[PDB]
Symmetry: C2
Subunit: 533 residues, 2 copies
């Protein structure tokens, strides 16, 4: 007497064709029904929400999305046994509690986005989401908002690029047995000004005294989810190369030059080489444990970079699939921890297969921006593709100079003992990172002299405008954990230098750059391990 | 009444021309008189030695040389005031004790050699050496044995190549005010079968109650000589790059593969990949803390290398001046600590001037044999110059593979946490190293897990014959200090692999390769820091 869905969902020859679609489905097992419910019932339950429900915008590292009568009816007929049975059949999940229900209504409006994840929380068995776009008009693909599925190139290593994506329509449902490590999906940012209404939900383990219930099963699942060995599949790695004994020795000695100050002055702005610049820079750090230099690079370099970068954004075509990223550039992986372009001093890697990865793990090389610089320059119009790189690689060498670190030690009265340097490019479509702590060196933590902190520096070279604030994304965020505690929320800017000294409690990330960004965010990141001087 | 020298040495217009030669002399202040003594007196004092004195061969890292009536007369007339006065005048040393005398007779016979040093021990003021070759025949330049002076490119940083060299004759004397840090000289190996007799000596500070004596002066000199900051001018450096967290993590895990064993088998010989090979290799190390694998590399590689190397020795022309060393090769400096060719993963450096050095210190890059490999291969007959390199660089990458270190960890039940790899070439004319200990990491020694030892490995790929024993040099020596204790004295061989685990007490060096060697000694050296597993 609840057969008020699409009559066909009850026709067994449709049901059977459906279990065999889900079976053949790629990259993991998922399915979609095109007009799930009685058209009249949706229009009603949409109309209702539209006039009764308040949706407020929320933003974290992983998403931006606006959250929160006969809607009740829809909730009953979905957790109805007539439907649960059918669902757990075509989907091959077996039994699923109609007692423990959970749904959520959300609108995705322009700029709203959920990026990659596997939906695997606690007790969820099957995940589904019915869509509620405008019934009267067709939802075009280019509007965005599509649901995207990720091929896994290793259990718990989703490929950076999605391989499936459906443009959902009004009465459409998408769902999938939640298979841990594989069911990676996200929702493509909404690139147009509209409000895509949606009802997400989840069926769960059958509960105590419920049809299909097995004792201890529920916990044999969630307690199962606890390992970190996946660390090895993070590129780039969060580990710092140690400094030559002479670099560190030299620094200590200083804290117990006419040629040095001229070296420094050919990259950094006179304002910060001056005694009173340095003096102020010293004052600020001592108190804030950070410093936020404006117009850091001197004009000659600031000009050149801006020129080659603004020129690469315009005359050039940014690769948007990982397979398309060409040397010197690598793409950061996996997509459920981050996704951005970058050049480190290392040998070229394009991870498409498990073997590509394993290769790089066995043949692990050390960073060398000089060799890299040489190699690019030997090649040589697409060459503007390298104009920006050469410019930026020169910039990399400079911050790898023992003189620069001397300058750095001076500002901070801290001695650099290690170094990592990465020049990164976040593209409006795709790039971002998520809130994470820093990875102190395991070899060093067994040592007093090196304090439990990482000196993190970021030199933004983002040329374009409108990064305020910060509905365009790309902003860098630091903050504590355990109500908000954001310590820095710096939108992308041109020619700024940020220095934080992070302990464990501080989490950082640069927010997904929105598709509507006028350019990619460029910057040079640099971490150092640090001793007391 | 001792005017039985060359009458002219007493003529003041010769004396004055002499102080102005020593003044203009390069690279530091030194002089030579062509027929110092009464010809009859030398012939007598030579004849005497020839028939009364026993000379026995002695050998250390720095030299090979045979050591040990009217000779007494020569000793009196040299420490005579008539002469001391004149000497300390033309030389500008002031007063010099005729009380505290010291001389030494030595013959240099074929293969005998003293390499670079500054003669600066204790109280010596001026250093001299009168020669006693065959009076009747002329000592030709190509016989070798010449005295050679080194330009200093920094106080206590002698240039690798000598800039002066005189072929001494019978009645010739060479001498120089001993100026610490600059007076670097050596004697070119004697390349011919003859016995060059010589009387070395030294004038000292004036002593207590002696003409020209100042109290506390003597000790204000020797106690002056005590600093280590010169470490920074050693290339290559004796410091190890740390391993990625995954490499070490992986090793621990193993000590708490069908694809690995096929990887290993494409460089190393089946004999040592077999379970019983491995088993024996394990037994040996556990007891000897070392192992000396014979025919290590498999035949296909052993053959290829031998081919390209034997081919580079023949068809090619080895650079013999540092300025001539071309990429990929660097020369090790300074010459009073070592001198040999080598390729490390690093960017090309040719140190001729103080600025060349400083450049490299400021722009310190990390090793990368892959980039290096690429760069060589892009270039391309002189190209055999690279045939051997490509062959050897491939060999380098293999020992930098996380798989190989896994294999290494297995033999030793030790975990590699760091790595340095150098492929080196010792040339018959010039190359060698001296007895030194290992340089434990200063950052790590503050840590229990890493034991106080370095795992040192050497893969000799010396093709030629006659390295026995070991009058040709090039042998690798380990030993303790504080009577002989040599722990290993392995002449150069083809395709051997040596593994020692050195603590502090063990000193190593590869002996000066003699000019008469049939080829250069080639090898791949590799050091690792090590944790307990
Ligand atoms: Fe989801
Ligand atoms: Fe000497």
């Amino acid at each position: 007497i609840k057969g008020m869905f699409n009559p066909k969902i009850w026709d067994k020859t449709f049901q059977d064709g459906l279990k065999k679609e889900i079976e053949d489905s790629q990259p993991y097992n998922w399915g979609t029904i095109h007009e799930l419910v009685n058209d009249d019932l949706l229009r009603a339950v949409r109309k209702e929400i539209e006039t009764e429900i308040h949706f407020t915008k929320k933003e974290t590292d992983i998403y931006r999305v606006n959250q929160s009568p006969n809607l009740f009816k829809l909730r009953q007929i979905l957790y109805s046994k007539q439907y649960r049975d059918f669902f757990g059949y075509v989907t091959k999940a077996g039994k699923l509690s109609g007692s423990k229900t959970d749904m959520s209504i959300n609108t995705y409006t322009k700029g709203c986005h959920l990026l990659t994840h596997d939906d695997v929380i606690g007790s969820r068995r099957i995940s589904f989401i019915l869509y509620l776009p405008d019934p009267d008009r067709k939802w075009k693909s280019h509007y965005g908002g599509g649901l995207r599925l990720f091929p896994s190139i290793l259990p718990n290593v989703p490929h950076s690029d999605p391989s499936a994506k459906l443009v959902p329509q009004f009465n459409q449902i998408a769902f999938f047995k939640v298979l841990p490590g594989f069911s990676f999906h996200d929702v493509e940012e909404v690139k147009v000004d509209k409000h895509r209404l949606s009802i997400q939900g989840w069926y769960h383990i059958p509960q105590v005294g419920e049809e299909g219930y097995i004792p201890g099963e529920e916990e044999a699942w969630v307690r199962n989810n606890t390992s970190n060995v996946l660390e090895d599949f993070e590129f780039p790695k969060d580990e710092r190369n140690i400094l030559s004994f002479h670099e560190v020795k030299h620094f200590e000695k200083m804290l117990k030059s006419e040629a040095e100050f001229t070296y420094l002055s050919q990259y950094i702005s006179p304002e910060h080489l001056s005694s009173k610049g340095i003096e102020k820079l010293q004052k600020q750090f001592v108190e804030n444990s950070s410093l936020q230099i404006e117009s850091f690079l001197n004009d000659d370099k600031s000009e050149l970079l801006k020129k080659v970068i603004k020129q690469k954004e315009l005359e050039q075509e940014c690769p948007y699939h990982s397979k398309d990223v060409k040397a010197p550039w690598k793409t950061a992986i996996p997509p459920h921890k981050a996704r951005y372009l970058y050049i480190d001093g290392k040998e070229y890697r394009n991870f498409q297969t498990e073997a590509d990865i394993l290769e790089a793990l066995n043949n692990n090389d050390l960073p060398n921006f000089q060799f890299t610089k040489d190699a690019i320059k030997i090649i040589s119009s697409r060459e503007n593709n390298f104009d920006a790189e050469l410019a930026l690689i020169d910039l990399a060498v400079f911050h790898k100079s023992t003189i620069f670190k001397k300058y750095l030690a001076l500002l901070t009265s801290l001695c650099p003992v290690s170094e990592q340097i990465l020049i990164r490019r976040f593209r409006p479509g795709m790039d971002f990172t998520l809130a994470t702590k820093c990875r102190f060196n395991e070899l060093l933590k067994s040592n007093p002299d090196i304090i439990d902190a990482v000196l993190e520096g970021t030199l933004c070279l983002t040329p374009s405008a409108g990064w305020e604030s910060g509905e365009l994304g790309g902003y860098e965020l630091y903050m504590m954990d355990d109500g908000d505690s954001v310590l820095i929320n710096d939108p992308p800017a041109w020619n700024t230098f940020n220095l934080v000294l992070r302990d464990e409690s501080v989490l950082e990330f640069v927010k997904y750059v929105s598709w509507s960004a006028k350019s990619s965010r460029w910057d040079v990141k640099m971490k150092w391990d640090v001793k007391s001087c």
